[PDB]
Amino acid sequence: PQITLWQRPLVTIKIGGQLKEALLDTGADDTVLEEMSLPGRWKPKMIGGIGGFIKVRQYDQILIEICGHKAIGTVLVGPTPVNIIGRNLLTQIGCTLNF
Amino acid sequence: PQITLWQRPLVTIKIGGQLKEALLDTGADDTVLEEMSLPGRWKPKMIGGIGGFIKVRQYDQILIEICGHKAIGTVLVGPTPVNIIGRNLLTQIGCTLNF
Ligand SMILES: CC(C)(C)NC(=O)[C@@H]1CN(Cc2cccnc2)CCN1C[C@@H](O)C[C@@H](Cc1ccccc1)C(=O)N[C@H]1c2ccccc2C[C@H]1O
């Protein structure tokens, strides 16, 4: 698709057999989802944005479907205000910025 | 241009006759630039990022030059680590997300 930016670019993702809403976010290096339980072991990570750092949980090789495009990649879990799809998974599903 | 997302999407902007580098951020609602002096009076605002809220100064009716293209709109100035061009100005230059 082509998504213009007058509204937030929210798409629907499927992860863990659930459907969630997430923001497509070119300003985010990584993908962070709200507090959920995902399979397997986790490592620790701190990510910093505006307002400071949060401590999140890094899971690897997670399957997540964005607009019916399957990506398998690293997903962070933590107290983020919105689910954010960031560059590590945007590159996978072939996403560019155009003007 | 067609900007890919293997690296951060940094481009050159011009505001107040200064050249700056800044991030094309589809996840940002507003444009937030690093502490600098602008023409006009400002309203104060609280905007919230990933690690919580910061206080910014809001200037209206500001022209920025992004890769040639002019855009005018609200610009917030405040303690941000990186310069961020959000949706409010991304729309004016005709920016879209394509996959
Ligand atoms: C207006 C303003 C700019 C303040 N907006 C944001 O910060 C929004 C906030 N919401 C939330 C919100 C807050 C309040 C109200 N509604 C919504 C969540 C997403 N962001 C958008 C982010 O794209 C902003 C960037 C800024 C940045 C980039 C690089 C380095 C430092 C800062 C961001 O936070 N990116 C970071 C990031 C993000 C996720 C995972 C890893 C990493 C690393 C890093 O790239």
Side-chain angles (χ1 to χ4, degrees), chain A residues 8 23 25 27-32 47-50 76 81-82 84, chain B residues 8 23 25 27-30 32 47-50 53 81-82 84:
Chain A
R8 289 186 175 190
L23 181 68
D25 192 339
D29 305 324
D30 314 291
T31 296
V32 213
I47 48 183
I50 300 278
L76 312 189
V82 277
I84 291 158
Chain B
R8 299 192 162 161
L23 186 74
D25 187 350
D29 296 339
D30 303 299
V32 196
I47 51 167
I50 251 302
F53 275 72
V82 47
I84 287 140

mmCIF file of all heavy atoms in Angstrom, chain A residues 8 23 25 27-32 47-50 76 81-82 84, chain B residues 8 23 25 27-30 32 47-50 53 81-82 84, ligand 1:
data_model
loop_
_atom_site.group_PDB
_atom_site.id
_atom_site.type_symbol
_atom_site.label_atom_id
_atom_site.label_comp_id
_atom_site.label_asym_id
_atom_site.label_seq_id
_atom_site.Cartn_x
_atom_site.Cartn_y
_atom_site.Cartn_z
ATOM 1 N N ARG A 8 -2.055 9.164 11.988
ATOM 2 C CA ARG A 8 -1.001 8.228 12.414
ATOM 3 C C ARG A 8 -0.975 7.036 11.517
ATOM 4 O O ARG A 8 -2.029 6.412 11.277
ATOM 5 C CB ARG A 8 -1.201 7.746 13.861
ATOM 6 C CG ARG A 8 -0.939 8.816 14.885
ATOM 7 C CD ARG A 8 -0.994 8.277 16.274
ATOM 8 N NE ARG A 8 -0.630 9.301 17.232
ATOM 9 C CZ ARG A 8 -0.397 9.064 18.522
ATOM 10 N NH1 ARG A 8 -0.514 7.835 19.023
ATOM 11 N NH2 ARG A 8 -0.066 10.068 19.324
ATOM 12 N N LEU A 23 2.040 1.358 15.387
ATOM 13 C CA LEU A 23 2.491 2.523 14.642
ATOM 14 C C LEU A 23 3.695 2.153 13.793
ATOM 15 O O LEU A 23 4.685 1.666 14.306
ATOM 16 C CB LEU A 23 2.903 3.549 15.654
ATOM 17 C CG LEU A 23 3.407 4.882 15.184
ATOM 18 C CD1 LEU A 23 2.274 5.668 14.533
ATOM 19 C CD2 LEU A 23 3.921 5.576 16.433
ATOM 20 N N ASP A 25 6.950 3.275 12.316
ATOM 21 C CA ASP A 25 7.732 4.337 12.930
ATOM 22 C C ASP A 25 9.162 4.350 12.408
ATOM 23 O O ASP A 25 10.041 3.692 12.944
ATOM 24 C CB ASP A 25 7.692 4.136 14.446
ATOM 25 C CG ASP A 25 8.220 5.323 15.222
ATOM 26 O OD1 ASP A 25 8.965 6.138 14.665
ATOM 27 O OD2 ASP A 25 7.912 5.429 16.410
ATOM 28 N N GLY A 27 11.296 6.553 12.815
ATOM 29 C CA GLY A 27 12.233 7.165 13.746
ATOM 30 C C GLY A 27 12.673 6.187 14.816
ATOM 31 O O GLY A 27 13.439 6.561 15.729
ATOM 32 N N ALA A 28 12.100 4.978 14.799
ATOM 33 C CA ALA A 28 12.445 3.934 15.778
ATOM 34 C C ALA A 28 13.415 2.893 15.187
ATOM 35 O O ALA A 28 13.110 2.254 14.156
ATOM 36 C CB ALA A 28 11.148 3.245 16.305
ATOM 37 N N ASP A 29 14.593 2.733 15.814
ATOM 38 C CA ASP A 29 15.536 1.701 15.380
ATOM 39 C C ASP A 29 14.988 0.325 15.556
ATOM 40 O O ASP A 29 15.180 -0.505 14.692
ATOM 41 C CB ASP A 29 16.842 1.833 16.096
ATOM 42 C CG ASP A 29 17.419 3.198 15.931
ATOM 43 O OD1 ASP A 29 17.271 3.780 14.844
ATOM 44 O OD2 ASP A 29 17.954 3.754 16.901
ATOM 45 N N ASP A 30 14.217 0.105 16.619
ATOM 46 C CA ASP A 30 13.708 -1.227 16.942
ATOM 47 C C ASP A 30 12.215 -1.248 17.121
ATOM 48 O O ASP A 30 11.579 -0.221 17.251
ATOM 49 C CB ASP A 30 14.329 -1.733 18.229
ATOM 50 C CG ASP A 30 15.832 -1.514 18.281
ATOM 51 O OD1 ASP A 30 16.552 -2.194 17.505
ATOM 52 O OD2 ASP A 30 16.274 -0.677 19.112
ATOM 53 N N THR A 31 11.671 -2.459 17.188
ATOM 54 C CA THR A 31 10.236 -2.734 17.385
ATOM 55 C C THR A 31 9.970 -3.014 18.889
ATOM 56 O O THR A 31 10.632 -3.859 19.472
ATOM 57 C CB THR A 31 9.882 -3.957 16.508
ATOM 58 O OG1 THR A 31 10.080 -3.596 15.143
ATOM 59 C CG2 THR A 31 8.482 -4.444 16.726
ATOM 60 N N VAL A 32 9.051 -2.263 19.514
ATOM 61 C CA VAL A 32 8.690 -2.452 20.922
ATOM 62 C C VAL A 32 7.224 -2.632 20.999
ATOM 63 O O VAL A 32 6.459 -1.800 20.506
ATOM 64 C CB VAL A 32 8.865 -1.238 21.842
ATOM 65 C CG1 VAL A 32 9.246 -1.737 23.199
ATOM 66 C CG2 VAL A 32 9.823 -0.221 21.271
ATOM 67 N N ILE A 47 16.391 1.210 25.886
ATOM 68 C CA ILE A 47 16.218 2.034 24.697
ATOM 69 C C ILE A 47 15.829 3.407 25.166
ATOM 70 O O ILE A 47 15.099 3.558 26.147
ATOM 71 C CB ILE A 47 15.119 1.449 23.754
ATOM 72 C CG1 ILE A 47 13.878 1.118 24.567
ATOM 73 C CG2 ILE A 47 15.630 0.159 23.066
ATOM 74 C CD1 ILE A 47 12.833 0.511 23.751
ATOM 75 N N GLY A 48 16.365 4.413 24.480
ATOM 76 C CA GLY A 48 16.101 5.813 24.829
ATOM 77 C C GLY A 48 15.456 6.623 23.718
ATOM 78 O O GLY A 48 15.745 6.442 22.524
ATOM 79 N N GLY A 49 14.428 7.360 24.098
ATOM 80 C CA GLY A 49 13.791 8.268 23.174
ATOM 81 C C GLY A 49 13.748 9.631 23.785
ATOM 82 O O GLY A 49 14.758 10.133 24.263
ATOM 83 N N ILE A 50 12.645 10.308 23.535
ATOM 84 C CA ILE A 50 12.329 11.608 24.123
ATOM 85 C C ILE A 50 11.902 11.301 25.559
ATOM 86 O O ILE A 50 11.188 10.317 25.808
ATOM 87 C CB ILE A 50 11.125 12.251 23.321
ATOM 88 C CG1 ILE A 50 11.521 12.436 21.848
ATOM 89 C CG2 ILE A 50 10.705 13.549 23.914
ATOM 90 C CD1 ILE A 50 12.319 13.664 21.555
ATOM 91 N N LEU A 76 11.054 -6.217 21.044
ATOM 92 C CA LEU A 76 11.251 -5.788 22.429
ATOM 93 C C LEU A 76 9.894 -5.665 23.103
ATOM 94 O O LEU A 76 8.906 -5.400 22.436
ATOM 95 C CB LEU A 76 11.969 -4.433 22.481
ATOM 96 C CG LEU A 76 13.232 -4.167 21.656
ATOM 97 C CD1 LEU A 76 13.875 -2.870 22.043
ATOM 98 C CD2 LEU A 76 14.192 -5.293 21.816
ATOM 99 N N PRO A 81 4.225 3.475 25.264
ATOM 100 C CA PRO A 81 2.853 3.986 25.154
ATOM 101 C C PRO A 81 2.026 3.365 24.041
ATOM 102 O O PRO A 81 0.826 3.151 24.247
ATOM 103 C CB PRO A 81 3.016 5.495 24.952
ATOM 104 C CG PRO A 81 4.454 5.775 25.452
ATOM 105 C CD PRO A 81 5.220 4.571 25.108
ATOM 106 N N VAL A 82 2.645 3.060 22.891
ATOM 107 C CA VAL A 82 1.957 2.425 21.745
ATOM 108 C C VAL A 82 2.784 1.280 21.208
ATOM 109 O O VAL A 82 3.981 1.246 21.388
ATOM 110 C CB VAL A 82 1.811 3.410 20.566
ATOM 111 C CG1 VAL A 82 0.579 4.323 20.767
ATOM 112 C CG2 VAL A 82 3.087 4.214 20.440
ATOM 113 N N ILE A 84 5.039 -0.165 18.567
ATOM 114 C CA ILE A 84 5.840 0.563 17.569
ATOM 115 C C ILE A 84 6.534 -0.460 16.684
ATOM 116 O O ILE A 84 7.277 -1.315 17.188
ATOM 117 C CB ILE A 84 6.932 1.386 18.247
ATOM 118 C CG1 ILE A 84 6.294 2.538 19.012
ATOM 119 C CG2 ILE A 84 7.994 1.804 17.228
ATOM 120 C CD1 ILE A 84 7.145 3.115 20.122
ATOM 121 N N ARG B 8 19.198 5.110 9.780
ATOM 122 C CA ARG B 8 18.241 6.161 10.178
ATOM 123 C C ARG B 8 17.942 7.126 9.019
ATOM 124 O O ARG B 8 18.866 7.623 8.372
ATOM 125 C CB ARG B 8 18.762 6.978 11.371
ATOM 126 C CG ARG B 8 19.007 6.181 12.654
ATOM 127 C CD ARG B 8 19.231 7.129 13.853
ATOM 128 N NE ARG B 8 19.039 6.454 15.132
ATOM 129 C CZ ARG B 8 19.500 6.890 16.304
ATOM 130 N NH1 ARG B 8 20.111 8.057 16.406
ATOM 131 N NH2 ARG B 8 19.358 6.146 17.386
ATOM 132 N N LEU B 23 15.735 13.995 11.406
ATOM 133 C CA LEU B 23 15.194 12.656 11.210
ATOM 134 C C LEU B 23 13.755 12.738 10.676
ATOM 135 O O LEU B 23 12.927 13.452 11.231
ATOM 136 C CB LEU B 23 15.219 11.949 12.560
ATOM 137 C CG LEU B 23 14.846 10.492 12.598
ATOM 138 C CD1 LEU B 23 15.987 9.677 12.025
ATOM 139 C CD2 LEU B 23 14.564 10.140 14.040
ATOM 140 N N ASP B 25 10.498 11.185 10.626
ATOM 141 C CA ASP B 25 9.987 10.312 11.655
ATOM 142 C C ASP B 25 8.473 10.182 11.506
ATOM 143 O O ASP B 25 7.715 10.986 12.021
ATOM 144 C CB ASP B 25 10.377 10.921 13.011
ATOM 145 C CG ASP B 25 10.060 10.039 14.183
ATOM 146 O OD1 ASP B 25 9.363 9.019 14.034
ATOM 147 O OD2 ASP B 25 10.468 10.406 15.285
ATOM 148 N N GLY B 27 6.671 8.327 13.079
ATOM 149 C CA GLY B 27 6.050 8.002 14.348
ATOM 150 C C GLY B 27 5.804 9.242 15.178
ATOM 151 O O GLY B 27 5.119 9.177 16.197
ATOM 152 N N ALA B 28 6.427 10.353 14.810
ATOM 153 C CA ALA B 28 6.221 11.633 15.501
ATOM 154 C C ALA B 28 5.030 12.441 14.945
ATOM 155 O O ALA B 28 4.961 12.715 13.728
ATOM 156 C CB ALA B 28 7.481 12.465 15.373
ATOM 157 N N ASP B 29 4.131 12.860 15.836
ATOM 158 C CA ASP B 29 3.026 13.752 15.467
ATOM 159 C C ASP B 29 3.503 15.152 15.155
ATOM 160 O O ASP B 29 2.971 15.791 14.252
ATOM 161 C CB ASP B 29 1.996 13.858 16.589
ATOM 162 C CG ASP B 29 1.314 12.543 16.886
ATOM 163 O OD1 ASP B 29 1.311 11.640 16.018
ATOM 164 O OD2 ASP B 29 0.749 12.427 18.001
ATOM 165 N N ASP B 30 4.508 15.617 15.897
ATOM 166 C CA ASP B 30 5.033 16.981 15.803
ATOM 167 C C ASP B 30 6.466 17.022 15.359
ATOM 168 O O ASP B 30 7.139 16.013 15.259
ATOM 169 C CB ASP B 30 4.922 17.673 17.148
ATOM 170 C CG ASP B 30 3.526 17.698 17.639
ATOM 171 O OD1 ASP B 30 2.680 18.291 16.946
ATOM 172 O OD2 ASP B 30 3.228 17.065 18.661
ATOM 173 N N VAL B 32 10.127 18.483 16.408
ATOM 174 C CA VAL B 32 10.753 18.852 17.650
ATOM 175 C C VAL B 32 12.170 19.068 17.304
ATOM 176 O O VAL B 32 12.838 18.163 16.847
ATOM 177 C CB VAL B 32 10.736 17.725 18.692
ATOM 178 C CG1 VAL B 32 11.034 18.303 20.066
ATOM 179 C CG2 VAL B 32 9.419 17.039 18.718
ATOM 180 N N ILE B 47 5.143 17.507 25.609
ATOM 181 C CA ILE B 47 4.961 16.389 24.692
ATOM 182 C C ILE B 47 5.614 15.166 25.255
ATOM 183 O O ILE B 47 6.632 15.289 25.890
ATOM 184 C CB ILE B 47 5.604 16.651 23.344
ATOM 185 C CG1 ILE B 47 7.042 17.088 23.553
ATOM 186 C CG2 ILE B 47 4.780 17.618 22.556
ATOM 187 C CD1 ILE B 47 7.842 17.070 22.261
ATOM 188 N N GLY B 48 5.052 13.993 24.972
ATOM 189 C CA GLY B 48 5.533 12.745 25.552
ATOM 190 C C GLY B 48 6.177 11.797 24.562
ATOM 191 O O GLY B 48 5.690 11.627 23.435
ATOM 192 N N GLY B 49 7.388 11.366 24.886
ATOM 193 C CA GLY B 49 8.062 10.377 24.069
ATOM 194 C C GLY B 49 7.963 9.013 24.718
ATOM 195 O O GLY B 49 6.981 8.701 25.412
ATOM 196 N N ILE B 50 9.040 8.255 24.536
ATOM 197 C CA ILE B 50 9.199 6.872 24.978
ATOM 198 C C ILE B 50 9.561 6.842 26.485
ATOM 199 O O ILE B 50 9.003 6.056 27.252
ATOM 200 C CB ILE B 50 10.283 6.200 24.053
ATOM 201 C CG1 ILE B 50 9.617 5.197 23.113
ATOM 202 C CG2 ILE B 50 11.407 5.601 24.853
ATOM 203 C CD1 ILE B 50 8.886 4.156 23.791
ATOM 204 N N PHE B 53 7.673 12.569 29.507
ATOM 205 C CA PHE B 53 7.377 13.885 28.928
ATOM 206 C C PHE B 53 8.512 14.903 29.018
ATOM 207 O O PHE B 53 9.287 14.884 29.966
ATOM 208 C CB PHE B 53 6.156 14.446 29.630
ATOM 209 C CG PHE B 53 4.881 13.973 29.055
ATOM 210 C CD1 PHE B 53 4.457 12.658 29.255
ATOM 211 C CD2 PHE B 53 4.147 14.804 28.223
ATOM 212 C CE1 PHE B 53 3.317 12.164 28.626
ATOM 213 C CE2 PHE B 53 3.012 14.346 27.588
ATOM 214 C CZ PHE B 53 2.577 13.018 27.786
ATOM 215 N N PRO B 81 17.382 14.752 21.848
ATOM 216 C CA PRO B 81 18.731 14.349 21.443
ATOM 217 C C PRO B 81 19.019 14.548 19.959
ATOM 218 O O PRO B 81 20.151 14.839 19.568
ATOM 219 C CB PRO B 81 18.799 12.875 21.823
ATOM 220 C CG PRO B 81 17.375 12.470 22.015
ATOM 221 C CD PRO B 81 16.622 13.633 22.441
ATOM 222 N N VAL B 82 17.982 14.390 19.145
ATOM 223 C CA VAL B 82 18.089 14.438 17.696
ATOM 224 C C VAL B 82 16.967 15.352 17.153
ATOM 225 O O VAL B 82 15.947 15.577 17.835
ATOM 226 C CB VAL B 82 17.964 12.984 17.108
ATOM 227 C CG1 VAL B 82 16.815 12.225 17.702
ATOM 228 C CG2 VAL B 82 17.857 13.025 15.653
ATOM 229 N N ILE B 84 13.864 16.215 14.762
ATOM 230 C CA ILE B 84 12.827 15.277 14.312
ATOM 231 C C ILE B 84 11.759 16.003 13.472
ATOM 232 O O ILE B 84 11.143 17.002 13.912
ATOM 233 C CB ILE B 84 12.127 14.575 15.538
ATOM 234 C CG1 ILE B 84 13.066 13.567 16.147
ATOM 235 C CG2 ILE B 84 10.855 13.906 15.149
ATOM 236 C CD1 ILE B 84 12.956 13.621 17.663
HETATM 237 C C1 LIG C 1 6.584 14.173 19.201
HETATM 238 C C2 LIG C 1 7.672 13.171 19.629
HETATM 239 C C3 LIG C 1 8.805 13.326 18.846
HETATM 240 C C4 LIG C 1 8.019 13.566 20.998
HETATM 241 N N1 LIG C 1 7.097 11.867 19.541
HETATM 242 C C5 LIG C 1 7.559 10.701 19.945
HETATM 243 O O1 LIG C 1 8.607 10.585 20.569
HETATM 244 C C6 LIG C 1 6.729 9.488 19.622
HETATM 245 C C7 LIG C 1 6.149 8.948 20.914
HETATM 246 N N2 LIG C 1 5.321 7.712 20.934
HETATM 247 C C8 LIG C 1 4.565 7.429 22.160
HETATM 248 C C9 LIG C 1 3.459 8.371 22.651
HETATM 249 C C10 LIG C 1 3.739 9.174 23.736
HETATM 250 C C11 LIG C 1 2.732 10.017 24.199
HETATM 251 C C12 LIG C 1 1.485 10.026 23.568
HETATM 252 N N3 LIG C 1 1.121 9.248 22.470
HETATM 253 C C13 LIG C 1 2.187 8.429 22.064
HETATM 254 C C14 LIG C 1 6.127 6.664 20.490
HETATM 255 C C15 LIG C 1 6.999 6.950 19.284
HETATM 256 N N4 LIG C 1 7.551 8.321 19.145
HETATM 257 C C16 LIG C 1 8.201 8.441 17.856
HETATM 258 C C17 LIG C 1 9.692 8.100 17.871
HETATM 259 O O2 LIG C 1 9.774 7.830 16.504
HETATM 260 C C18 LIG C 1 10.805 9.103 18.226
HETATM 261 C C19 LIG C 1 12.276 8.663 18.245
HETATM 262 C C20 LIG C 1 13.224 9.819 18.611
HETATM 263 C C21 LIG C 1 14.647 9.398 18.639
HETATM 264 C C22 LIG C 1 15.262 8.752 17.564
HETATM 265 C C23 LIG C 1 16.585 8.343 17.648
HETATM 266 C C24 LIG C 1 17.291 8.588 18.828
HETATM 267 C C25 LIG C 1 16.681 9.242 19.905
HETATM 268 C C26 LIG C 1 15.350 9.648 19.805
HETATM 269 C C27 LIG C 1 12.515 7.506 19.207
HETATM 270 O O3 LIG C 1 12.077 7.547 20.366
HETATM 271 N N5 LIG C 1 13.312 6.543 18.752
HETATM 272 C C28 LIG C 1 13.898 5.555 19.643
HETATM 273 C C29 LIG C 1 13.185 4.186 19.797
HETATM 274 C C30 LIG C 1 11.878 3.816 19.841
HETATM 275 C C31 LIG C 1 11.501 2.487 19.984
HETATM 276 C C32 LIG C 1 12.441 1.451 20.083
HETATM 277 C C33 LIG C 1 13.813 1.721 20.054
HETATM 278 C C34 LIG C 1 14.216 3.029 19.924
HETATM 279 C C35 LIG C 1 15.519 3.782 19.811
HETATM 280 C C36 LIG C 1 15.294 5.148 19.203
HETATM 281 O O4 LIG C 1 15.389 5.170 17.786
#
